[PDB]
């Protein structure tokens with residue numbers, strides 16, 4: 156009944172885990188995200204973006220053109236359920252979201268939207284009954 160999890164990244168294009176389970180008993184869930192590499196966000200930035208799996212492609216396409224100042228996420232993108240800002244080496248961030256925003260009928264994917272990272276840096280998130 157833990158309603159928090161920690162996902163790390165580094166100077167590669169992989170997350171530390173590729174599956175996150177959110178307990179349906181949680182009212183809110185927190186994802187802590189840390190970058191343990193030594194390269195900065197200009198060249199090796201990472202973020203954690205959550206969307207329904209069918210929407211990842213379009214969110215990633217539009218987000219790549221939104222710019223670093225918009226964390227590579229289109230401003231007001233209604234397909235993004237929750238996201239963190241981009242972080243570089245030695246930085247940490249987190250995001251908390253309401254578990255009621257998720258449905259048991261849908262599939263979800265978390266991924267990094269820094270240009271060129273989404274194909275490898277992605278995982279599945281599911282609501283655990």
Ligand SMILES: [Cu+2]
Nearest residue numbers: 200201267272
């Ligand atoms: Cu990344």
